[PDB]
Amino acid sequence: EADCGLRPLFEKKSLEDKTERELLESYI
Amino acid sequence: GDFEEIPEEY
Amino acid sequence: IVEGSDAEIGMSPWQVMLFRKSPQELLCGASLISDRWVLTAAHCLLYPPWDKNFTENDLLVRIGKHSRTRYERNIEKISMLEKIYIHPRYNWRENLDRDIALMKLKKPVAFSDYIHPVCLPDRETAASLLQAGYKGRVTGWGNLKETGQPSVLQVVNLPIVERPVCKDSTRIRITDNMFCAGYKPDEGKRGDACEGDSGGPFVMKSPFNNRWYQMGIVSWGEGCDRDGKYGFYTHVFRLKKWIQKVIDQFG
Ligand SMILES: N[C@H](Cc1ccccc1)C(=O)N1CCC[C@H]1C(=O)NCc1cccc(Cl)c1
Ligand code: NA
Ligand code: NA
């Protein structure tokens, strides 16, 4: 989809889940 | 078994 | 999933449960990739050493779920299979090379707060994200240890491991169509997929466009969460050509 991978209860509302920052921090 | 039964329709 | 945590509501809205019609039980995990296509592991459907060979009418897809066992009225949606497509060069005889399959649904599923598809990587997102040390996330309703069952969907974040470490951890022949993930014994942290988590997604959130991509499929491991061992995942991007051919021909 054009909207794939954007979760209604998180990205679509600019809310983060409790552990996605662990992934971000691993991405250099 | 351990699973709640589903609606017969499926 | 072992050493993971309960998922949040709507955390993995592409999560799919493959469910056996009789006896009624969890068969595998899977993922939603469009309103009528579901991706899983081939070994979920075809694995002759264990006398496994499922047909379309043997299974259902349960989408939107959180609880493992409960029927989640007004939230989950339950779908019938139109057709199963297994990779024609899936290697069930030796090492589960090309462990991938597609399932087309009889009717489109309605998206909702709890039901939404994941993205599949393009070559550039794959080259950027599939790097040793970068973490992904694996989700499933499978066993909590090697040998309880969870009440709800479990989640664990795991780092991609360098190919020589993957190769040196096992006597099985590893291919470019796999990658491995997990912590090393000295890293402290642990966690892994386990039985029942087969076919579920390994996802990453792209820091470039902030979308979730499914990079891997839960494929195989020697035991679960053992020190010095790693879980192995189907490399989705490497099999992209096959996925598009199927979707483009059978729509
Ligand atoms: N334990 C076997 C090892 C094996 C690998 C390649 C080919 C033959 C056997 C395995 O994982 N199997 C036997 C066939 C199904 C798969 C499995 O249980 N996968 C589930 C699993 C468990 C732990 C970690 C992961 Cl990533 C996946
Ligand atoms: Na080896
Ligand atoms: Na391990």
End-to-end CA distance of chain B: 18
Strands C15-21 and C178-181: unpaired
Quick check: is C198 catalytic? Answer: yes
The resolution, in Å, is 1.6
Residue nearest to atom 7 of ligand 1 (CA): C95
In this structure, the number of other CB atoms found within 10 A of the CB of residue C96 comes to 23
Q: Does C57 touch chain B (CB under 8 A)?
A: no
Phi and psi torsions of C154, nearest 5°: -110, 150
Q: How far apart are CA A23 and CA C133, in angstroms?
A: 10
Do the beta carbons of residue C244 and residue C33 sit within 8 Å?
no
Q: How many domains does chain A have?
A: 1
CA distance A5 to C65: 17
Helix (H, G, I), strand (E, B) or coil at C171: coil
Contact C28, C42 (CB under 8 A): no
- Structural domain containing residue A7: 1-28
The type of residue at C250 is F
d(CA C107, CA C26): 22
Amino acid at C245: K
What's CA C25's distance to the chain center, in Å?
Answer: 18
Coil, strand or helix: which one is C201? strand
What is the three-state SS of chain C?
A: CECCEECCCCCCCCEEEEEEECCEEEEEEEEECCCCEEEECHHHCEEHHHCEECCHHHEEEEECCCECCCCCCCCCEEEEEEEEEECCCCECCCCCECCCEEEEECCCCCCECCECCCECCCHHHHHHHCCCCCEEEEEECCCCCCCCCCCECEEEEEEECCHHHHHHCCCCCCCCCEEEECCCHHHCCCCECCCCCCCCEEEEECCCCCCEEEEEEEEECCCCCCCCCCEEEEECHHHHHHHHHHHHHHC
Q: How was this structure determined?
A: X-ray
Question: How many Å apart are CA C15 and CA C26, to the nearest integer?
Answer: 13
Active site residue C51: no
The CATH number that applies at residue A28 is: 4.10.140.10
Token pair 């589960």 is found at: C96
Tokens of C251: 């729509």
In the sheet with C135-140, reading across from the earlier edge strand, the strands are C5-6, C154-159, C135-140, C201-205, C212-220, C231-235, C178-181
Residue C234 · residue C100 · CB < 8 Å: yes
Asked if the Cβ–Cβ distance from A23 to C204 is below 8 Å, we say yes
How many angstroms separate the CA atoms of A11 and C151, rounded?
26
Which ligand gives the minimal distance to the CA of C233? 1
Q: In the structure, which protein residues have their CB atom closer than 6 angstroms to any atom of ligand 1? A: C 43, 47, 95-96, 172, 192-195, 198, 218-222, 224, 231-232
Which domains, from first to last, does chain C contain?
Answer: 1-12+118-237 (2.40.10.10), 13-117+238-251 (2.40.10.10)
On whether any CB of chain C is under 8 Å from the CB of A16, the answer is: no
